[PDB]
Amino acid sequence: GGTILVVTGTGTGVGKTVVCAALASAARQAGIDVAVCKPVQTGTARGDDDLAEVGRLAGVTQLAGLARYPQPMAPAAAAEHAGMALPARDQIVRLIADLDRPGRLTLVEGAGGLLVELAEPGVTLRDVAVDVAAAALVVVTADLGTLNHTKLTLEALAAQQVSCAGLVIGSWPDPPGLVAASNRSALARIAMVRAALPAGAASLDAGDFAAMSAAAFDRNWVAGLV
Amino acid sequence: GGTILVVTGTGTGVGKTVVCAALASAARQAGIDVAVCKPVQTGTARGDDDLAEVGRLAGVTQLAGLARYPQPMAPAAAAEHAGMALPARDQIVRLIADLDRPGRLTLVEGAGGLLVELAEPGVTLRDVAVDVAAAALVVVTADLGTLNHTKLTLEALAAQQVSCAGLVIGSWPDPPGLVAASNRSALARIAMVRAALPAGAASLDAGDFAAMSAAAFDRNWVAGLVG
Numbered sequence: 369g370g371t372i373l374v375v376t377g378t379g380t381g382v383g384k385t386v387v388c389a390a391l392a393s394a395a396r397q398a399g400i401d402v403a404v405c406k407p408v409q410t411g412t413a414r415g416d417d418d419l420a421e422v423g424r425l426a427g428v429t430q431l432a433g434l435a436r437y438p439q440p441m442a443p444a445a446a447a448e449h450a451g452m453a454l455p456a457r458d459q460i461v462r463l464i465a466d467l468d469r470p471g472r473l474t475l476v477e478g479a480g481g482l483l484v485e486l487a488e489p490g491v492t493l494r495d496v497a498v499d500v501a502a503a504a505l506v507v508v509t510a511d512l513g514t515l516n517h518t519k520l521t522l523e524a525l526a527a528q529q530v531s532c533a534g535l536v537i538g539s540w541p542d543p544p545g546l547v548a549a550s551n552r553s554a555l556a557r558i559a560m561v562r563a564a565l566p567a568g569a570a571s572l573d574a575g576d577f578a579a580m581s582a583a584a585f586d587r588n589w590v591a592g593l594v
Numbered sequence: 595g596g597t598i599l600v601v602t603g604t605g606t607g608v609g610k611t612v613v614c615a616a617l618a619s620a621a622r623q624a625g626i627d628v629a630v631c632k633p634v635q636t637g638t639a640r641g642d643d644d645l646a647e648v649g650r651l652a653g654v655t656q657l658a659g660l661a662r663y664p665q666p667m668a669p670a671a672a673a674e675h676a677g678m679a680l681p682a683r684d685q686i687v688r689l690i691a692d693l694d695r696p697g698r699l700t701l702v703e704g705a706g707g708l709l710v711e712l713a714e715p716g717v718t719l720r721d722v723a724v725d726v727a728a729a730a731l732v733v734v735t736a737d738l739g740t741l742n743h744t745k746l747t748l749e750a751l752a753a754q755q756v757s758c759a760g761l762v763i764g765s766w767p768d769p770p771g772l773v774a775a776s777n778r779s780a781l782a783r784i785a786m787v788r789a790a791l792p793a794g795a796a797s798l799d800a801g802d803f804a805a806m807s808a809a810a811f812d813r814n815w816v817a818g819l820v821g
């Protein structure tokens with residue numbers, strides 16, 4: 369096959385989706401074919417559609433999903449509220465494996481943090497990454513507390529031999545500030561910081577977002593992904 | 595010795611200090627001698643003093659500090675900003691060991707989350723807990739995101755065989771929305787929820803705080819903490 373990368377985060381609302389779009393965009397601009405799988409989407413009642421975000425920000429067309437829940441909650445809580453089960457582990461893993469092909473960078477977005485239940489029973493994006501032999505890109509914030517959450521997430525990855533492909537700071541403030549500046553240096557000593565997306569990047573149009581994305585990542589690392 | 599509990603949290607600003615005071619208050623009301631220690635305190639330049647707040651809220655007089663740093667940041671960054679060094683591992687252990695005595699509950703309040711560096715090189719409250727044979731009480735929020743952070747924290751505890759003394763929800767909203775309610779039920783399936791402090795607990799005066807504290811915990815769990 370090709371390269372499967374799961375795009376996780378230290379938590380919820382840390383920029384997972386915008387990073388997935390940024391990497392997608394930078395990889396497409398490197399001539400890499402990109403697909404994104406988001407097996408479970410919640411929050412559809414209020415308009416949440418992370419696949420469409422990547423579609424519009426990055427131009428990706430291979431956008432694979434299995435389930436959509438109206439409530440802006442955890443997949444398990446959203447599915448409980450809807451009275452309908454989450455998808456099965458086999459559906460997620462097989463969808464990703466069917467998406468994966470030579471020459472292609474396939475990004476996998478879960479929901480919230482790394483140990484969030486995505487499929488029955490208590491299957492997580494970590495289990496899925498083990499099953500498809502994917503490495504994990506970990507999206508982190510620049511804010512107070514990001515170091516503990518990052519170290520916690522990287523331990524959980526290594527505790528299951530899920531390789532860490534690096535960190536991305538989901539939102540980099542202007543101008544940084546003492547905590548943000550200190551955190552960025554401390555994060556680099558924990559793992560490779562592959563990018564720090566400027567704050568506000570999620571609101572960019574497709575051309576501006578592509579420009580930002582190409583500049584945010586190191587071309588050689590992107591091109592080395594596949 | 596007695597019982598040493600480290601009081602940690604899923605992150606920063608989740609209620610560790612108020613939980614430390616609430617459990618100290620509850621233990622003191624059951625006649626248990628309580629000492630609270632804060633190995634590393636930052637933010638002294640804006641008046642942060644968790645030992646002083648624990649003393650204010652719970653009446654604890656046996657309060658032991660060690661390292662203090664002005665800036666309200668992580669210990670490593672706050673020490674580097676002040677031109678100072680982090681304490682060594684053995685200094686934190688000595689701080690705690692000197693407090694430990696039979697019949698006494700010694701609470702060790704961390705700074706930030708569990709894997710925060712408290713001593714060079716990369717020594718965390720988890721290591722300290724191994725060193726002094728302490729279990730860890732994990733303070734959590736009820737907010738969206740708490741389940742992942744709680745499971746991450748508990749996994750990190752088990753990875754070094756640090757027993758989890760249970761969870762405490764540091765602020766419980768009244769009434770709870772769907773997410774808060776769903777989270778409390780899910781949290782109780784991953785570990786014992788020892789208490790759920792009512793929102794605004796940090797503002798209660800001494801009497802109300804002591805009453806809140808006595809209600810928040812199961813008297814038999816508190817009284818069983820130390821013989």
Ligand SMILES: O=C(O)Cc1ccc(C[C@@H]2CCC[C@H]2CC(=O)O)cc1
Nearest residue numbers: 513514515516606607666668705706
């Ligand atoms: O995890 C990191 O980013 C590193 C890290 C972030 C924050 C803290 C403690 C904060 C700092 C000032 C106030 C205190 C409140 C608290 O005790 O949580 C320690 C380490």
Ligand SMILES: O=C(O)Cc1ccc(C[C@H]2CCC[C@@H]2CC(=O)O)cc1
Nearest residue numbers: 380381440442479480739740741742
């Ligand atoms: O960990 C918990 O407490 C449970 C939990 C919490 C939040 C999510 C993600 C979703 C939920 C809605 C917006 C968010 C969008 C996103 O962050 O991708 C998943 C599991």
